[PDB]
Design a protein around this ligand. Structure first.
Ligand SMILES: *[C@@H]1O[C@H](CO)[C@@H](O)[C@H](O)[C@H]1NC(C)=O
Ligand SMILES: *[C@@H]1O[C@H](CO)[C@@H](O)[C@H](O)[C@H]1NC(C)=O
Ligand SMILES: *[C@@H]1O[C@H](CO)[C@@H](O)[C@H](O)[C@H]1NC(C)=O
Ligand SMILES: *[C@@H]1O[C@H](CO)[C@@H](O)[C@H](O)[C@H]1NC(C)=O
Ligand SMILES: N[C@@H](Cc1ccccc1)C(=O)O
Ligand SMILES: N[C@@H](Cc1ccccc1)C(=O)O
Ligand SMILES: N[C@@H](Cc1ccccc1)C(=O)O
Ligand SMILES: N[C@@H](Cc1ccccc1)C(=O)O
Ligand SMILES: [Ca+2]
Ligand SMILES: [Ca+2]
Ligand SMILES: [Mg+2]
Ligand SMILES: [Mg+2]
Ligand SMILES: [Zn+2]
Ligand SMILES: [Zn+2]
Ligand SMILES: [Zn+2]
Ligand SMILES: [Zn+2]
Lengths: 481, 481
């Protein structure tokens, strides 16, 4: 469909003149950031952003691509080079080292320099690189980790953990030799490495001893505690702090977030990862946006400010499944959380960055008409005389042959939340992609986020903005306010 | 391979500290641009940039992804939304309207608002939108069009032409009803719409009457003139201007570019598109970089400045073929032309933008090791127990089944300049992609290129920077110098 307003050049000329006006009004701050927020869309590459924008646009009144995402409104954009030291196409652990600790690492390690080696516990020590969240805490800020994955998953773990193996969620996962060598499982590291004021996401099971029924699924033994060492890490965490609260459901979370006596909050909402938003039980489980608000309620009390990590963690998971519907709906909820955090904080004193750890082999093509569903069919048949979707994957589990042939696909099929877009190469999981991802920034010193930068720049600009180590001699005036 | 230097956090911390230093040193100009250059990588989306960076890096001493492209050094980056008014995934003609005229258009039209309709000549008039190049000429600047495509191809045509059908290269292509209605073929528009000081690229055949042997291929009748109206447009163009020169080969081009009496230069180096760089005859044909230098030699003489359009036009063509080797080698040469133009001009008075018209369904995945060839195999077999490449396409002509099965692929095969990467969906040509593309900017007012913008912003910032209509009341001081 051609929107009539857009047929007049004046429409475009007015928009551009307004854009030039806004561009000209941008001024760099002379002042530091009181607060830091990093919003991490796991797997949210450029193609994901555009596709999500179109989907979000259409979910409102709109044709799609002309409607800004909340992230699109951020004034400063850079490209971020995501390669890990050892792999061009990276994983979440080693990218987390980059954007949270400011140093690049090796694939499937977390919080370690690239002197360490995956799955070799004895290469850990001396290679620990401290996150900006950790430095924020040291400087007296409150700190929070919020994600739709396990809070022990690679991205959130980057804020607090140092491990040669991102798969070491609980002690059950750690080989005996590594346990003897003192490489702590991530769940332990979560409660032990540093004080974290707010921890919200999945990963209940890693905190409890084998045999402990999950509070939510007490009749599914597979969801129970995993720990071999008999520890209840939740109780240990609570015991260390007056005003600490543990919650496992939404209503308790909301209650805790409004309770002035709650100074530390651990909310673990599923045994493993949280459900996709489309599957979320809204009585039992908070959305990402809700977890972010709950976090901000607590974190905002500290006069020294806060550092908050918010992850749209299952964007990534949707793409691995080659289910763009899941990737893109997770992206929208991620963007909704960005929007919500922007309502609850001030860009005068809050530096907010939105980025992705890496992308995926997700493409948006064919030549679909304006306003057509992102989950629809490309116009025109393929050379094998069957239909194809506008969304495709380079590889992944959407690759199919029914009786020697690529299957035809209908619109009703392609639009299903379970539909797997086709790919060139069958893999159980679609792969990450290595192309640059966007960094969006607003707030004090956001203007430093520019050009094409290494992914480590994300961590460094945040430290610098808040005058955290190694930039305590930042040359900045106190935060506005 | 893990580079040892990168195992030390200090490496990353030093780089980031240097990046922060450079970021802090950026200051906006108070002064106008004397000169404007737009470098257009046709089809050069984010995945293409990263893949080309890696390839370029490796062509030098290097592992790849850590080595900046010339474009990567530009200080200001924005994302550009490429949708056409009528299609989410755009073409080159209507995007050219956006980034060259500052108004979005309908798929496969050029230089027309979206009130016009593809292939309907009678919707043309009143919908012409004037390019910034045209406005630059009006303001007394010299202007140049340089591309590896036909100079009548959609992108360069955006600088001078207005047509409802980008396929109307010569009168041979224009239906009789359109010819009667006065819709001029693009080759005619090239010599007639405006004065263009430098025109360099392909497209000889459209300028000459049917039966005119091509100077380079006088024994291949398919390469001869196409025109039905008996006109020699080259002679007509030459006749209009004292100091005008026509050349069809590299040595004459170089000679003309150094000749002070040559004020207007038309260099048409192939009958249609120029050869891929890997196929270029370096005795007969200038590279993109050479054409850009030749252009700058002439354009730079004007004390009022110049507008120059430089297109890496066959990046796009490589992706359509699903031959990433061709896409990426064209990208490197494009980047080499950017680098060369940066040597020959000053960022104190030259606003240079690098962008793409749109992307492609090109992906860079698997989990290849650092330093591995971008054209190599992903580690690990696919689920059908055969190898697969790190580079894939969502759709296109690399889709194959040999005896009911996806073919296996070897490294020697995947590395060939003729290799077609596999795709999910067989199409004779791989499709464009609709995701945002990068805009890189440097020079006066380049700091206005920020955030996520409509693709029309490219044209408007350039007009504004040089105080061209509609921004003659730009509020800017004269160009530095
Ligand atoms: C780590 O342990 C492995 C297995 O015993 C051994 O081969 C290697 O030498 C150790 N590396 C270090 C740094 O001690
Ligand atoms: C939320 O958790 C508390 C236990 O902390 C429990 O008393 C309440 O029943 C829970 N809500 C639901 C709906 O299970
Ligand atoms: C363009 O010509 C077509 C074919 O005759 C006709 O259907 C249509 O009305 C014309 N449109 C305009 C704007 O005159
Ligand atoms: C280049 O063109 C001129 C004609 O303009 C011709 O005299 C010369 O032979 C040409 N060079 C080659 C190598 O064909
Ligand atoms: N990050 C993905 C897949 C992956 C990660 C790391 C290495 C390889 C694959 C998953 O855990 O959901
Ligand atoms: N809709 C609420 C629900 C909620 C809040 C806080 C905590 C838990 C739940 C939110 O945005 O805040
Ligand atoms: N731009 C491509 C293919 C294309 C353009 C426009 C529409 C559809 C396809 C080609 O001409 O090389
Ligand atoms: N290598 C030269 C060749 C050349 C120059 C000018 C014109 C034509 C050819 C270039 O960069 O300039
Ligand atoms: Ca739950
Ligand atoms: Ca030639
Ligand atoms: Mg993650
Ligand atoms: Mg082009
Ligand atoms: Zn990830
Ligand atoms: Zn992943
Ligand atoms: Zn194009
Ligand atoms: Zn194309």
């Amino acid at each position: 469909i051609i929107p009539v307003e857009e047929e007049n050049p004046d429409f475009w000329n007015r928009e551009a003149a307004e854009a030039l006006g806004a561009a000209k009004k941008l001024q760099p701050a002379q002042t530091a950031a009181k607060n830091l927020i990093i919003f991490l869309g796991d797997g949210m590459g450029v193609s994901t952003v555009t596709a999500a924008r179109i989907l979000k646009g259409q979910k409102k009144d709109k044709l799609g691509p002309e409607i800004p995402l909340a992230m699109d409104r951020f004034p400063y954009v850079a490209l971020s080079k995501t390669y890990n030291v050892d792999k061009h196409v990276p994983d979440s652990g080693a990218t987390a080292t980059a954007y949270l600790c400011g140093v690049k690492g090796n694939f499937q390690t977390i919080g370690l320099s690239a002197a360490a080696r995956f799955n070799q516990c004895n290469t850990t020590r001396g290679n620990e690189v401290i996150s900006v969240m950790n430095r924020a805490k040291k400087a007296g800020k409150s700190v929070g980790v919020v994600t739709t994955t396990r809070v022990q998953h690679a991205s959130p773990a980057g804020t607090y953990a140092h491990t040669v193996n991102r798969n070491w969620y609980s002690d059950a996962d750690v080989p005996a030799s590594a346990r003897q060598e003192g490489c702590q499982d991530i769940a332990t590291q979560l409660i032990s490495n540093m004080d974290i004021d707010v921890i919200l996401g999945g990963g209940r099971k890693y905190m409890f001893r084998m045999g402990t029924p999950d509070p939510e699924y007490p009749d599914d033994y597979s969801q129970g505690g995993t720990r071999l060492d008999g520890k209840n890490l939740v109780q240990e965490w609570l015991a260390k702090r007056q005003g600490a609260r543990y919650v496992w459901n939404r209503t308790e979370l909301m209650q805790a977030s409004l309770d002035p006596s709650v100074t530390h909050l651990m909310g673990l909402f599923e045994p493993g990862d949280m459900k996709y938003e489309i599957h979320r039980d809204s009585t039992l489980d908070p959305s990402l946006m809700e977890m972010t608000e709950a976090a901000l309620r607590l974190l905002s009390r500290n006069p020294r400010g806060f550092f908050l990590f918010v992850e749209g963690g299952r964007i990534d998971h949707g793409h691995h499944e080659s289910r763009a519907y899941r990737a893109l709906t997770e992206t929208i909820m991620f963007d909704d959380a960005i929007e919500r955090a922007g309502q609850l904080t001030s860009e005068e004193d809050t530096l907010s960055l939105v980025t992705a750890d890496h992308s995926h082999v997700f493409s948006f093509g064919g030549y679909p008409l304006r306003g057509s569903s992102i989950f629809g069919l490309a116009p025109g048949k393929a050379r094998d005389r069957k239909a194809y979707t506008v969304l495709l994957y380079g590889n992944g589990p959407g690759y199919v042959l029914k009786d020697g042939a690529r299957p035809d696909v209908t619109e009703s099929e392609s639009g299903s939340p379970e539909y797997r877009q086709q790919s060139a190469v069958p893999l159980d999981e679609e792969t990450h992609a290595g192309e640059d991802v966007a960094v969006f920034a607003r707030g004090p010193q956001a203007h430093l986020v520019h050009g094409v930068q290494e992914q480590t720049f994300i961590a460094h600009v945040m430290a610098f903005a808040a005058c955290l180590e190694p930039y305590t001699a930042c040359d900045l005036a106190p935060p506005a306010g």
